[PDB]
Ligand binder design. Structure first.
Ligand SMILES: [Ca+2]
Ligand SMILES: [Ca+2]
Ligand SMILES: [Ca+2]
Ligand SMILES: [Ca+2]
Ligand SMILES: [Ca+2]
Ligand SMILES: [Ca+2]
Lengths: 164, 164, 164, 181, 181, 164
């Protein structure tokens, strides 16, 4: 059948937060989940027209010394159009996490499994499952290298050969 | 088995043989069948390590006036390492065809079904099912534009992110 | 029967990363998994001709203070010939991990269970399941002593007595 | 039937040659002569990589096929010397064409290895892959050869030794083609 | 078992190779190109004595056998030229390898001879002996070849003519040996 | 039970007895049967701690002219500690053979099937099933070259990495 099931785990974001610039509410990461953001899924969506996100998980992997103060709040807004970047908006989303800067965590988001479009278009809601937003909570004492990883699983349909 | 089955038709070769240059035995098309040669299988092998050829057929679709002279012989050598490019080598193999330049033909070859490698290596026998050769039979009279297409079906395995 | 099942856990790599030299993308570990790299499996493959890797896991055990910044990305390329040493290439592999320098992790790779050859030869793909690559992510503040361990399980066949 | 601009080609049976041929035979893969005293322990009397070229009729048959599978493979060490000859031989078929280990222990480790005196003949019934091998040569010879037969001296030979190493082979050839060296 | 002066030889399967092999195939026995005007009446386009050497796989197979019998023999005249070409050809298989008569009447006298236009393909179903022939060459070639296939022009060709002469052959090989040229 | 069963034939001893030196009772071969004596079992015991002898047979294969004089007596003492090397000790044991120098014989001995230790220790009775002795009977006339081979089958246990 045209449907092929792919899974993988890749880094959606890499950010560096210097010491003291991580004020409360600062936006460390704001990544709109698109197939191009994921390498293997990037090629897979380059050879397909439609994709549906069966499973989606995120892993916040901040690489900082244990003596680092402050923390982060990480969430997955299931609306690509939504631009709210406050603590309450993230915490309202299912699976959002709050953790110290030296404590890696996992986000298990909730979203609607609809058949999306691999290629971009006018309406972003038909192409992306949502956005991942990672904000600072409090103040960080050291420099934090944050890697945001995404464990994904998709179903691909309508074969084609697209261009970026 | 997280094996992805992918299939489709794609042009492996495009050749423009000018009138008068198509002497007998001239190698119009010489293509070692690797996934990088195929457009969609190119990306599929870019995101996978291993592939197995389940279905392989070649379609010689030359576009020239019906009053043109000469012909072609097309054949699939199941050995990628073999470098013999003559009418005898093509006639020995199975699935080979010989037809006039205005005719469209199908080569149904004898190919290995083992698990080959998408990337290149020291031994070509572990990476390609074989090569396809299209030669002139006689001398052409008009300008011939021959496109060699391939209906292929593969099974892909061992996810990765390869480079050209 | 000739088939004997062996398992074990041994250190494939020992590396020392001084303070500040662990720049992002630096290659800490690049080990081609061969039976000689594993002591007990080294002797076992010295008394056999063929081996098949039934189970393969890796444990990254970096020994550094909790106040160490930066991290690592560890992966198992299931292609011994592949020489890509970038973050995306590792992350595309199944089971790849990203972690802080003071956080031990485990890699559960995916690979094709084919009957390999214990002794070396021209084509490396017939002798090795792949390579383990461990790269730096960000900058390390302290000195990191990294031990890369491999928990393996093999099936051995075709008895012989080989020499190194 | 009207006259067309061009008629369709009428070549029908093209690319339909025979695919499988079973070929059996027996041939001398080696012949060695040893003057007295030369056959010290460990001396390599015979070292022959079993390939279609080594067997003449199989070589000619493999020149017109792409792949071959060894259905049957057996060897005979037939030394034609009297019973007053001292010393002996060890013979074994290494299933790895690449391995070049030439010792008593390496041969004895293999299945079917024989240790005999120079006035005794033996049959080596070895362990060989049944998988399809390539008739033509390539970069890796593990895809083209089932292995190599090795024959060493165990002790010093008192007299001259004439040893002939024979092979009964049965093969199935497949994927017809026309190979050239 | 007492120790004798010498033991009997234990070579058993020697001289027991395969005797009969049926080999079939199809090959181009000739290829000719004719520029405009050269193909006058009676011009000998093709003159090929059908021997195992003419057929490559059959040549290699006959190098390891002594005798062969032609079970099936058919020829195809396949001229790859347009329908606007003038002239024609006569094709026939003379069952006598020695006869070198190259005329229209000599070819037409034989059974299965075909007369066609240059834009028409024909199949020659000839008359050939089923008796055992010798794979290797000798003084008299009537014992080694079933005959010769001959192809002449009937009229002047207006355009260039490319003609390929093919052969479907089936043979049974017997009396195994190892021939050398 | 992660017990590895390994078997094969290997030469335990190679002796060159020159003509005239083979007086009656001369100890041609004296070998305490330990896994280090066997070539392939050498590596097998190098990667294991304990072994149990399931099958043990010795093959005396002397290579000499049929007109040579004298003979040999071969026997397996089931006690490694025993130091009696005489015809009487060999004739007392079971499985012993006596034959002319041109004859090839098989000693099927009486050996313990308990779990012995691959390494050496204070007590030899916990490490070896016994010893094999090959003695001269009479005086030889020609130079004798005797190889003592052993068909052995063992069960190995308790993985380790031993030293010579
Ligand atoms: Ca699209
Ligand atoms: Ca690769
Ligand atoms: Ca080997
Ligand atoms: Ca070939
Ligand atoms: Ca002859
Ligand atoms: Ca020990």
């Amino acid at each position: 059948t045209n449907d092929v099931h792919l899974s993988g785990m890749s880094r959606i974001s890499q950010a560096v937060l210097p010491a003291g610039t991580g004020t409360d509410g600062y936006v460390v990461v704001d990544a709109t989940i698109v197939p191009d953001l994921l390498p293997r899924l990037g090629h897979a969506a380059r050879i397909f027209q439609r994709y549906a996100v069966e499973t989606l998980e995120f892993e916040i992997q901040p690489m900082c010394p244990a003596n680092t103060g402050g923390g982060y709040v990480a969430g997955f807004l299931p609306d690509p159009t939504d631009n709210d970047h406050t603590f309450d908006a993230l915490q309202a989303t299912r699976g959002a996490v709050v953790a110290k800067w030296w404590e890696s965590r996992t986000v298990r988001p909730q979203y609607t499994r609809t058949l999306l479009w691999t290629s971009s278009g006018k309406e972003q809601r038909l192409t992306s499952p949502g956005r991942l937003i990672l904000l600072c909570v409090g103040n960080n004492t050291d420099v934090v290298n944050v890697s945001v990883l995404c464990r994904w699983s998709v179903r691909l349909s309508v074969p084609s050969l697209e261009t970026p």
